């Protein structure tokens, strides 16, 4: 299958509890360039193994 | 002196009087309030559903905004 490394990506994932993220819709306006480029990579190439660098 | 049961009529209690009569409702006037409540009913309800649309699009926007999810 050839899986990704044990170190993986992102150190200390997620901020805190849920609903907190859903409370602010300002996350759409500010910081959109990394979110859209990850979205553009993932629909073109369905594999999570390739577009993990953008994530 | 002789004392017997005495006769008394006074008002005669009114022999056969009609009590049933038309009250409140007339006919055509009830339809003006009846269908009038319906037209007021839809107009008040549909304005709330347009206000629901303000919430609806904003709710689905949260999913699009959340990509780390």
Curated annotation (Swiss-Prot), chain A:
Where is the secretion signal located?
A: none
**Which residues are in the CHCH domain?**
28-55
Q: Where is this motif: Cx9C motif 1?
A: 31-41
Q: Which cysteines in this chain are paired by disulphide bridges?
A: 41-51
Subcellular location per UniProt equals: Mitochondrion inner membrane; Mitochondrion intermembrane space; Mitochondrion
Oligomer and partners: Complex I is composed of 45 different subunits.
Family assignment from sequence similarity:
Belongs to the complex I NDUFA8 subunit family.
The entry's function note states: Accessory subunit of the mitochondrial membrane respiratory chain NADH dehydrogenase (Complex I), that is believed not to be involved in catalysis. Complex I functions in the transfer of electrons from NADH to the respiratory chain. The immediate electron acceptor for the enzyme is believed to be ubiquinone.
Q: What is known of its domains?
A: Contains four C-X9-C motifs that are predicted to form a helix-coil-helix structure, permitting the formation of intramolecular disulfide bonds.
Q: What is this protein called?
A: NADH dehydrogenase [ubiquinone] 1 alpha subcomplex subunit 8
Coverage span on the entire protein: 6 to 60 of 172
From Swiss-Prot, chain B:
How is this protein named in the record?
NADH dehydrogenase [ubiquinone] 1 alpha subcomplex subunit 13
Q: Which residues cross the membrane?
A: 27-46
Subunit note:
Complex I is composed of 45 different subunits. Interacts with CARD15, but not with CARD4. Interacts with STAT3, but not with STAT1, STAT2 and STAT5A. Interacts with OLFM4.
Q: What does this protein's UniProt record list under function? A: Accessory subunit of the mitochondrial membrane respiratory chain NADH dehydrogenase (Complex I), that is believed not to be involved in catalysis. Complex I functions in the transfer of electrons from NADH to the respiratory chain. The immediate electron acceptor for the enzyme is believed to be ubiquinone. Involved in the interferon/all-trans-retinoic acid (IFN/RA) induced cell death. This apoptotic activity is inhibited by interaction with viral IRF1. Prevents the transactivation of STAT3 target genes.
Family per UniProt? Belongs to the complex I NDUFA13 subunit family.
Q: Which organism is it from?
A: Bos taurus (Bovine)
Highest taxon of the lineage = Eukaryota
Compartment(s) where it occurs, according to its Swiss-Prot or TrEMBL record: Mitochondrion inner membrane; Nucleus
Q: Which residues of the full protein are shown?
A: 32 to 74 of 144
